[PDB]
Amino acid sequence: LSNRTNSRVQSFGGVPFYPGITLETWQKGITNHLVAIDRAGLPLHFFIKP
Amino acid sequence: LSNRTNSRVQSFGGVPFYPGITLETWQKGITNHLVAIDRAGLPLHFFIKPDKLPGLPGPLVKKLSKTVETAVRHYYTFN
Amino acid sequence: ELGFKFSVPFGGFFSCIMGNPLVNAPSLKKCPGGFSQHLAVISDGCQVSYCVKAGIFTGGSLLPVRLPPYTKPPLM
Amino acid sequence: FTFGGVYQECTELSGDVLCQNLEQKNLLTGDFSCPPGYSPVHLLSQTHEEGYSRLECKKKCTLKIFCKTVCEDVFRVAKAEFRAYWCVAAGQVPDNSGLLFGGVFTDKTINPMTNAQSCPAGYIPLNLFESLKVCVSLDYELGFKFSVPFGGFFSCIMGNPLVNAPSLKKCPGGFSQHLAVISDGCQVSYCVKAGIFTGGSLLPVRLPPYTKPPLM
Amino acid sequence: TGFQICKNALKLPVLEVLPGGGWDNLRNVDMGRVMDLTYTNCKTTEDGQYIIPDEVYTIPQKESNLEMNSEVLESWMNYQSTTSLSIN
Amino acid sequence: LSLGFTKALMDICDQLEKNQTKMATYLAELLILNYGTHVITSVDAGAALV
Ligand SMILES: OC[C@H]1O[C@H](O[C@H]2[C@H](O)[C@@H](O)[C@H](OCCCCCCC3CCCCC3)O[C@@H]2CO)[C@H](O)[C@@H](O)[C@@H]1O
Ligand SMILES: *[C@@H]1O[C@H](CO)[C@@H](O)[C@H](O)[C@H]1NC(C)=O
Ligand SMILES: *[C@@H]1O[C@H](CO)[C@@H](O)[C@H](O)[C@H]1NC(C)=O
Incomplete structure (x- = not known):
């Protein structure tokens, strides 16, 4: 007999994840733990203006 | 009959671990017990700069940085 | 128009068994001009790549807002 | 020096099961x-054995009238010899055409350049031993921002040919010597410049400056 | 340069992981305070969880990684033999 | 820079000014022992478990 289970969880933002958590609890827990999931910007020299 | 069980737990930060603890309890307990898990820095002679030390003149702080850096080099070479 | 606003200058393809014919007829595994070389796929250990300009490719985590201006701030 | 890549030849000595991933x-x-202009360098050749139970079903017909399907399982010890090599620059190879070395790691060790058991972004892992993976960079810019100068490989039986043709077990120049893997008691190591490696707990922010504070 | 004034007001813990300290790159151990840490402004992380000194700023990279690997191997081999002989 | 680090640096500067390079190097090595080799500019607060 041979069992092999691999679980891998990766979270950005929200409550620290633990295995028994439900997506409901996690989704209701982002109310203050929000992180930058995408960002856009401008080159530095563009802001050195008279 | 032969049984052999080995458990090994290694924790950094959070509540002190005990066997009957659940990852929910451990994850909810890091609110105040956070630990440096990664760090980056700069050589200290990089901080010995004329603008960083008002009390001393520029030519002096240059020599000061030189001697500090050579002290670091000696400290590295010995070990 | 949609492609022009949603594409990148393209140099051509090449595989592990046949290189790019647009090198500078010999066909080498090298992107012509300033076109950069990025991996596209690995089919059964065979490497297939593409060539795009290095000016558009970047670190990629920060999407540029590089739209206007189309010239540096002109001096007085 | 230029590192043109590696390849691990696998020869089946019994069965055809081991060399499907080795x-x-x-x-x-x-x-x-190896690519043109590169001389393959014999890194190490070793044998590996593994037992497997293969199930097969056959239709045996006796007397052309008694036909029956019989399924049987056979426990065979497949043995295969793998020979791993690496491509070093033969001479003044064109620059910078080639590949870049992003460090190596095993399932039990760490990759000190990235401090992780994985390859950096834009890197591909190539299997080199039973448990050794090499991080190779195709893109030149991404490698140059994510690579370390490479000096060569050597084993416990064959040394580095770039020593200063004798092949000694020593990293040429200021290249440092760190262990890469241990295969059946044979040490395999690599050579990288000693200045880039450090204690490793603190990742120095070595980007600017490119000059010491210029005097007045 | 204490933080007790801020703690009395905000009633929050102070983030205990702070940069600006010395570091012995050989022994891999913290050494001593090089930068100056002051709590004049009673600065706080945006989420209102920790009091930080005025000389540091925090990027909120709230991330979690979980790996679980389980592997069970069982082998069972059972064998019996019965030989009977009778001579009359 | 902190008060103590500045004070130690001033002491080394004064010892150098006194044209006495002997205890200058000793004082510098004491600085190395007390404050280490690098200065940490960025950490990652967090936790880990195995
Ligand atoms: O059985 C004992 C062996 O079990 C494993 O090996 C496994 C291996 O990991 C698997 O890949 C293959 O089984 C494959 C089973 C089918 C292979 C033949 C294909 C058949 C399938 C049915 C239709 C005809 C073709 O060999 C064995 C038996 O499981 C391990 O190596 C080890 O525990 C032990 O040495
Ligand atoms: C593990 O093995 C058991 C038998 O002991 C089996 O019933 C089960 O499907 C396997 N997998 C998991 C995830 O339990
Ligand atoms: C210990 O031995 C018992 C039999 O007495 C067995 O059922 C069990 O699987 C073994 N292991 C543990 C962890 O109990």
Whole structure:
């Protein structure tokens, strides 16, 4: 007999994840733990203006 | 009959671990017990700069940085 | 128009068994001009790549807002 | 120096089960070889054995009238010899055409350049031993921002040919010597410049400046 | 340069992981305070969880990684033999 | 820079000014022992478990 289970969880933002958590609890827990999931910007020299 | 069980737990930060603890309890307990898990820095002679030390003149702080850096080099070479 | 606003200058393809014919007829595994070389796929250990300009490719985590201006701030 | 890639040849000595994952083509050539201008260097050849229960079903017909399907399982010890090599620059190879070295790691060790058991972004892992993976960079800019100068490989039986033709077990120049893997008691190591490696707990922010504070 | 004034007001813990300290790159151990840490402004992380000194700023990279690997191997081999002989 | 680090640096500067390079190097090595080799500019607060 041979069992092999691999679980891998990766979270950005929200409550620290633990295995028994439900997506409901996690989704209701982002109310203050929000992180930058995408960002856009401008080159530095563009802001050195008279 | 032969049984052999080995458990090994290694924790950094959070509540002190005990066997009957659940990852929910451990994850909810890091609110105040956070630990440096990664760090980056700069050589200290990089901080010995004329603008960083008002009390001393520029030519002096240059020599000061030189001697500090050579002290670091000696400290590295010995070990 | 949609492609022009949603594409990148393209140099051509090449595989592990046949290189790019647009090198500078010999066909080498090298992107012509300033076109950069990025991996596209690995089919059964065979490497297939593409060539795009290095000016558009970047670190990629920060999407540029590089739209206007189309010239540096002109001096007085 | 220029590192043109690696390839691990696999020879089946019994059965055809082991060499389905122990073989590694060279990335640039798509075959167990080296790119033009590169001389393959014998890194290490070792044998590996593994037992497996293969199930097979056959239709036996006796007297052309008694036909029956019989399924049987056989426990065979497949043995295969893998020979891993690496492509070093033969001479003044064109620059910077080739590949870049992003460090190596095993399932039990760490990759000190990234401090992780994985390859950096834009890097591909190539199988080199039973448990050794090499991080190779195709893009030149991404490698140059994510690589370390490479000096060569050597084993416990064959030394580095770039010593200063004798092949000694020593990193040429200021290249440092760190262990890469231990295969059946044979040490395999690599050579990288000693200045980039450090204690490793603190990742120095070595980007600017490119000059010491210029005097007045 | 204490933080007790801020703690009395905000009633929050102070983030205990702070940069600006010395570091012995050989022994891999913290050494001593090089930068100056002051709590004049009673600065706080945006989420209102920790009091930080005025000389540091925090990027909120709230991330979690979980790996679980389980592997069970069982082998059972059972064998019996019965030989009977009778001579009359 | 902190008060103590500045004070130690001033002491080394004064010892150098006194044209006495002997205890200058000793004082510098004491600085190395007390404050280490690098200065940490960025950490990652967090936790880990195995
Ligand atoms: O059985 C004992 C062996 O079990 C494993 O090996 C496994 C291997 O990991 C698997 O890949 C293959 O089984 C494959 C089973 C089918 C292979 C033949 C294909 C058949 C399938 C049915 C239709 C005809 C073709 O060999 C064995 C038996 O499981 C391990 O190596 C080890 O525990 C031990 O040495
Ligand atoms: C693990 O093995 C058991 C038998 O002991 C089996 O019933 C089960 O499907 C396997 N997998 C998991 C995830 O339990
Ligand atoms: C210990 O031995 C018992 C039999 O007495 C067995 O059922 C069990 O699987 C073994 N292991 C543990 C962890 O109990």
